[PDB]
A paper describes a structure:
Variable-heavy-heavy domains (VHHs) or nanobodies are single-domain heavy-chain only fragments found in members of the camelidae family (camels, llamas, alpacas, etc.). To explore antibody applications beyond traditional heavy-light chain mAbs, we identified and biophysically characterized a novel single-domain antibody specific for fentanyl from a camelid variable-heavy-heavy (VHH) domain phage display library. Our lead VHH (JGFN4) was specific for fentanyl and displayed no cross-reactivity with the closely related synthetic opioid carfentanil. The recognition of the fentanyl by JGFN4 was driven by hydrophobic interactions between the bottom of the binding pocket with the N-phenylpropanimide moiety and hydrogen bonding with a tertiary amine in the piperidine ring.
We next decided to investigate the structure and detailed interactions of the N76D mutation. As observed for JGFN4 WT, we obtained monomeric and dimeric forms of JGFN4 N76D when it was expressed in E. coli. Thus, it appears that the N76D mutation alleviates the need for JGFN4 dimerization via domain swapping in fentanyl binding. A comparison of the electrostatic surface potential for JGFN4 WT and JGFN4 N76D bound to fentanyl showed that the binding pocket of JGFN4 WT was narrower and less negatively charged compared to the strong negative charge in JGFN4 N76D. It was found that the substituted D76 side chain forms a hydrogen bond not only with the tertiary amine nitrogen of the piperidine moiety but also with the side chain of T28 from CDR1. This shift also brings the T28 side chain closer by ∼1.0 Å to the piperidine ring of fentanyl.
Residue numbers in the entry: 1 to 113
The structure:
């Protein structure tokens, strides 16, 4: 069992930045991938960014060059650096591993302008 804890979020303006963290606990050596997902009302949970153990990453085209996913190997934390924020980034953000299934509670992000 691996436990994931989302922290961060907030209310931002178009152009500002937020930093979300995802802290893993438990049998983290069986985790080879970590991803951030987001959801909006009426729409479906969609991928934002993913990172694997070697540090390679993929990004949704809507957040490429604005969002950055990174990891702290010593603290078992995956960060979502949300820069250059737009109103489209308003969503509840969720952390998940490569094993499909149990989500954390997520955290909320609102971007106004
Ligand atoms: C894509 C992510 C990834 O590869 N990980 C990760 C997972 C969740 C959240 C942050 C990072 C690793 C998990 C294992 N930790 C080391 C702990 C360890 C190592 C060796 C033996 C025993 C214990 C290194 C990072």
């Amino acid at each position: 069992q691996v436990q994931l804890v989302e922290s961060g979020g907030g209310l931002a303006q178009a152009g500002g930045s937020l930093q979300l963290s995802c802290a893993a606990s438990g049998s983290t050596s069986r985790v080879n991938a970590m991803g951030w997902y987001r959801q909006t009302p009426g729409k479906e949970r969609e991928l934002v960014a993913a990172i694997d153990r070697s540090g390679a990453t993929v990004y949704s085209e809507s957040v490429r060059g604005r969002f950055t996913i990174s990891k702290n190997d010593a603290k078992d934390i995956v960060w979502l650096q949300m820069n250059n924020l737009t109103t489209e980034d308003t969503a509840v953000y969720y952390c998940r591993s490569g094993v499909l299934g149990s989500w954390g509670l997520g955290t909320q992000v609102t971007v106004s302008s």
